[PDB]
Amino acid sequence: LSTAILKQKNRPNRLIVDEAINEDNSVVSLSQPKMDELQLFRGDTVLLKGKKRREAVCIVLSDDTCSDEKIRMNRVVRNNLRVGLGDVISIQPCPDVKYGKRIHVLPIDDTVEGITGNLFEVYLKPYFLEAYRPIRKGDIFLVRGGMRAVEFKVVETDPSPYCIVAPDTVIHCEGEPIKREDEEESLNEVGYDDIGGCRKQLAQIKEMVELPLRHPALFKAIGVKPPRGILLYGPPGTGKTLIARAVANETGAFFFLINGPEIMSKLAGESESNLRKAFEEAEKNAPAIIFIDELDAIAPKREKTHGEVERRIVSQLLTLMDGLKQRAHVIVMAATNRPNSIDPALRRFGRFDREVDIGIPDATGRLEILQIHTKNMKLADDVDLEQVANETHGHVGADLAALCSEAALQAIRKKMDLIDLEDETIDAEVMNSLAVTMDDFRWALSQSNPS
Amino acid sequence: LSTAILKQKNRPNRLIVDEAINEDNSVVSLSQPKMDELQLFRGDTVLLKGKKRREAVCIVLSDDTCSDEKIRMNRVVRNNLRVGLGDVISIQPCPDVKYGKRIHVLPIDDTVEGITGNLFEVYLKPYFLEAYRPIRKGDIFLVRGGMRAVEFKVVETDPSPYCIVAPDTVIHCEGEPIKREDEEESLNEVGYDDIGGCRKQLAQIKEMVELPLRHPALFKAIGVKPPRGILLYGPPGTGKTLIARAVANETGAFFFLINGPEIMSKLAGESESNLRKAFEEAEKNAPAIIFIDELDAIAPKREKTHGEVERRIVSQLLTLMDGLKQRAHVIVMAATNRPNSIDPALRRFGRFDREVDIGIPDATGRLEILQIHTKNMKLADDVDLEQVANETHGHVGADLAALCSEAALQAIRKKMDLIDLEDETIDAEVMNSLAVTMDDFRWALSQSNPS
Ligand SMILES: Nc1ncnc2c1ncn2[C@@H]1O[C@H](COP(=O)(O)OP(=O)(O)OP(O)(O)=S)[C@@H](O)[C@H]1O
Ligand SMILES: Nc1ncnc2c1ncn2[C@@H]1O[C@H](COP(=O)(O)OP(=O)(O)OP(O)(O)=S)[C@@H](O)[C@H]1O
Ligand SMILES: [Mg+2]
Numbered sequence: 001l002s003t004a005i006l007k008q009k010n011r012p013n014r015l016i017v018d019e020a021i022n023e024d025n026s027v028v029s030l031s032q033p034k035m036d037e038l039q040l041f042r043g044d045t046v047l048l049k050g051k052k053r054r055e056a057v058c059i060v061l062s063d064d065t066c067s068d069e070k071i072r073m074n075r076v077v078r079n080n081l082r083v084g085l086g087d088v089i090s091i092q093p094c095p096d097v098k099y100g101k102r103i104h105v106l107p108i109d110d111t112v113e114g115i116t117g118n119l120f121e122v123y124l125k126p127y128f129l130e131a132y133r134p135i136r137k138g139d140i141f142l143v144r145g146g147m148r149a150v151e152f153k154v155v156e157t158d159p160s161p162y163c164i165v166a167p168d169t170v171i172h173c174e175g176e177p178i179k180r181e182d183e184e185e186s187l188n189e190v191g192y193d194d195i196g197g198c199r200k201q202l203a204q205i206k207e208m209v210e211l212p213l214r215h216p217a218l219f220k221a222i223g224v225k226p227p228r229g230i231l232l233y234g235p236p237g238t239g240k241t242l243i244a245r246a247v248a249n250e251t252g253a254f255f256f257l258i259n260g261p262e263i264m265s266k267l268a269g270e271s272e273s274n275l276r277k278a279f280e281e282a283e284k285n286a287p288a289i290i291f292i293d294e295l296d297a298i299a300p301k302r303e304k305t306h307g308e309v310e311r312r313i314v315s316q317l318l319t320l321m322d323g324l325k326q327r328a329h330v331i332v333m334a335a336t337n338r339p340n341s342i343d344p345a346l347r348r349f350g351r352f353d354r355e356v357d358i359g360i361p362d363a364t365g366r367l368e369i370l371q372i373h374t375k376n377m378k379l380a381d382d383v384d385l386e387q388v389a390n391e392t393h394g395h396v397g398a399d400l401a402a403l404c405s406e407a408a409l410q411a412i413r414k415k416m417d418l419i420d421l422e423d424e425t426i427d428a429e430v431m432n433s434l435a436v437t438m439d440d441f442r443w444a445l446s447q448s449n450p451s
Numbered sequence: 452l453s454t455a456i457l458k459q460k461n462r463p464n465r466l467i468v469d470e471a472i473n474e475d476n477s478v479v480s481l482s483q484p485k486m487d488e489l490q491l492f493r494g495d496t497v498l499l500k501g502k503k504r505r506e507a508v509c510i511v512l513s514d515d516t517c518s519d520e521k522i523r524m525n526r527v528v529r530n531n532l533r534v535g536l537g538d539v540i541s542i543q544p545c546p547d548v549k550y551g552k553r554i555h556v557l558p559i560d561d562t563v564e565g566i567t568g569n570l571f572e573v574y575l576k577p578y579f580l581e582a583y584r585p586i587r588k589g590d591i592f593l594v595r596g597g598m599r600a601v602e603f604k605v606v607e608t609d610p611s612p613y614c615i616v617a618p619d620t621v622i623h624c625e626g627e628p629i630k631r632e633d634e635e636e637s638l639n640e641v642g643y644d645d646i647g648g649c650r651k652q653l654a655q656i657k658e659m660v661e662l663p664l665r666h667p668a669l670f671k672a673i674g675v676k677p678p679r680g681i682l683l684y685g686p687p688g689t690g691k692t693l694i695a696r697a698v699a700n701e702t703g704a705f706f707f708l709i710n711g712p713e714i715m716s717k718l719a720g721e722s723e724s725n726l727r728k729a730f731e732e733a734e735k736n737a738p739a740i741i742f743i744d745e746l747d748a749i750a751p752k753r754e755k756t757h758g759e760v761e762r763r764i765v766s767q768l769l770t771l772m773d774g775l776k777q778r779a780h781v782i783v784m785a786a787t788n789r790p791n792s793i794d795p796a797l798r799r800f801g802r803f804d805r806e807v808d809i810g811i812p813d814a815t816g817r818l819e820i821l822q823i824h825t826k827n828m829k830l831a832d833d834v835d836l837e838q839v840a841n842e843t844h845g846h847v848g849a850d851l852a853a854l855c856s857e858a859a860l861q862a863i864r865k866k867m868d869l870i871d872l873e874d875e876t877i878d879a880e881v882m883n884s885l886a887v888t889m890d891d892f893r894w895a896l897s898q899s900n901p902s
């Protein structure tokens with residue numbers, strides 16, 4: 001009912017991802033009735049939109065084994081769109097694409113140990129020659145070169161974000177090998193899928209933050225000013241910083257983070273300077289979101305705070321908040337676990353006049369969180385997350401994350417005598433057999449703690 | 452059952468130390484079936500691992516009076532490995548060893564009074580010539596030179612940590628004699644063997660600190676992030692600082708110590724600078740442990756603390772704690788005796804989210820502590836430590852150490868009339884007859900005090 005904004009809605013170009021028959025990195029497959037519906041001729045360059053603001057440029061072909069409302073794509077495309085089989089994507093016509101001037105690609109380190117020879121000659125030139133490949137900045141793609149397969153990252157493009165790779169296109173692969181951990185910490189990046197039992201609130205955040213920035217026309221047309229300060233509150237560990245990260249990674253808006261302790265750690269004046277620099281930066285760049293994490297650090301009750309610099313900072317913030325005129329298109333978000341210790345002046349009309357309660361999850365919410373946490377964990381058949389969800393009454397998201405960590409440590413302990421602290425590497429068999437059992441969860445449960 | 456991590460595990464190369472028949476400083480003996488099992492030819496340079504991260508480089512020879520699962524080595528090697536007869540050691544092949552360029556040795560002061568002549572000519576040259584001795588940095592070795600025996604320390608080596616001493620190797624013995632007290636305070640250095648009634652907690656520390664740094668692959672494979680802030684707490688004098696010292700000496704990780712009062716003693720800003728320098732240093736150096744001792748000195752509850760500089764430090768620490776990304780491989784340990792006075796922000800998820808209670812010892816634990824303290828004391832037959840353990844209901848390790856000191860002072864008092872405060876030296880006979888009796892302990896017990 002209120003949750004209406006979160007609903008996906010069926011569109012002509014909103015398609016479910018299926019596994020590819022054509023395993024080329026540049027190709028996506030559609031049924032023939034769907035291509036006619038979208039006015040897409042064979043071999044047209046297309047723009048695909050995934051999760052977490054991710055994109056890929058592909059060339060579209062007709063497939064008969066494919067269903068009407070499905071799209072076929074390999075792992076390389078699915079990775080670049082940060083999607084798994086079954087997820088929905090947008091498909092857009094893309095006749096805009098310029099021919100490429102200069103591109104800069106680099107190999108992922110762990111897929112490139114032993115023999116350089118020439119990376120352009122062995123791998124890249126046979127991959128691109130006469131292929132007229134569409135590529136996007138930040139694409140990770142795989143190329144076989146007889147012997148084995150090397151993954152490459154598109155670092156730069158001379159036509160703005162995406163281009164077609166023609167014979168003209170100078171292919172550079174100059175610098176050091178791109179680190180594996182960097183790109184794995186990039187897949188790590190928090191999206192809305194990584195936040196559990198918070199549906200009602202994510203709906204509220206998209207209403208108050210995402211909707212007025214992307215569509216200011218709506219609010220201006222109806223005759224209403226968009227609320228400009230949203231304050232997330234709730235007990236420690238409920239998911240506020242997580243939502244902050246999600247929003248940062250999910251929004252069309254420019255995002256600026258301010259950490260409370262990070263500001264208060266600075267020299268007198270140099271902190272007030274960074275607060276100003278934040279707001280000037282947000283004003284300068286697009287529709288924008290300013291996220292003040294741990295607000296109570298910077299803005300406690302002026303009445304009960306000893307230092308002059310500390311009182312000056314709260315005043316600096318209040319001024320900035322009223323300093324944005326309507327036409328700035330800047331929303332300030334803030335998170336706290338002690339809302340009652342914030343200066344009431346900041347919670348007045350026009351400032352942080354809207355509150356989102358990120359409270360304690362219910363039994364249903366906890367199950368989501370457990371499913372989110374264990375999505376990379378090796379679990380046994382006998383693990384019942386429904387059972388764990390019910391036995392975890394007072395638990396919030398942080399408590400559940402800890403529970404899963406201790407369940408895993410227990411499984412490591414059960415494998416201890418086949419492991420020693422002294423040897424350089426752990427045995428390969430021991431690594432594979434590692435599964436977290438329900439027994440492990442019950443041991444974690446017996447140790448667990450509220451609030 | 453949980454304690455599984457502490458268990459030693461039998462290995463082909465894990466051997467018991469027996470007394471040597473071959474009394475050379477460079478030589479270790481093994482049975483012939485064991486040499487074949489480890490693929491060790493006669494006269495191969497080997498690396499031995501002892502207690503408290505200590506090592507020796509030896510040359511291996513076959514012995515027939517030696518058992519299969521035993522190793523023979525003299526006092527000098529045992530000293531260098533900080534092991535006594537019966538302790539287990541690792542043995543490793545070592546064919547890496549370069550020929551030495553320059554070494555720097557120095558004599559131990561008390562073993563060098565009267566006649567210099569030439570230390571290199573009389574002692575060192577005949578010890579090394581055509582012998583191709585393996586030596587490690589930090590080795591203390593004894594050499595006879597007709598008249599008497601002088602102990603020398605290896606201060607420096609031009610091939611990194613260890614080298615072979617060939618005729619090529621320039622032998623320097625330039626500087627001042629190394630002080631006896633320096634090397635006895637180096638034998639003094641704390642290891643896990645010096646910490647009593649803390650088995651459960653030592654196992655926890657190895658799980659949360661040692662395991663994820665030496666084997667990050669386990670936690671990454673199972674799909675779990677390693678906890679990154681461990682907080683030791685308990686009453687005054689239970690052994691927190693003692694464990695701190697033990698870990699520092701026992702770990703494969705680079706270790707950085709921060710003392711609370713040592714930071715708070717510094718000028719405004721220059722304290723925040725050392726904190727950053729500590730974290731930047733730990734990040735720069737390997738897998739690392741940062742130990743913040745007496746954390747309550749640096750991080751009290753921001754709500755109830757007067758100084759602006761004092762509030763700024765807590766903020767500085769929080770920022771550093773969060774500043775470490777997962778892939779830093781740095782664990783922060785901290786100790787306190789008033790956990791309830793630390794800012795709660797620091798005890799949240801991702802910060803100091805794990806706790807180890809170093810509590811009051813039980814009757815069994817007290818016995819361990821008394822055995823650890825008295826290992827260098829001269830005791831009598833009638834001294835029953837089990838009796839003393841039972842009569843010490845409220846006592847913690849610090850109280851037990853003090854109890855032992857006062858028992859010993861009593862034994863000195865019993866010997867008083869044969870001693871006087873005015874004479875330059877104490878009589879030789881009086882020194883040897885000094886034993887701490889049971890009666891002394893009952894006197895110590897009558898004086899003792901709780902908490
Ligand atoms: N609703 C949630 N869904 C999924 N994971 C969660 C959720 N809440 C917490 N977690 C996990 O717990 C961790 C810590 O939660 P945070 O987002 O830091 O809590 P917080 O609300 O910011 O707490 P405070 O107020 O800063 S102490 C996250 O990194 C997640 O792994
Ligand atoms: N569990 C123990 N095992 C062996 N010796 C101990 C133990 N606890 C205390 N001691 C002895 O008592 C001395 C003082 O203990 P510390 O390690 O300083 O205690 P602490 O827990 O650091 O106390 P705080 O919190 O700094 S007041 C040590 O040097 C040891 O000699
Ligand atoms: Mg938070």
Ligand SMILES: [Mg+2]
Pocket residue numbers: 691692693
């Ligand atoms: Mg201490």
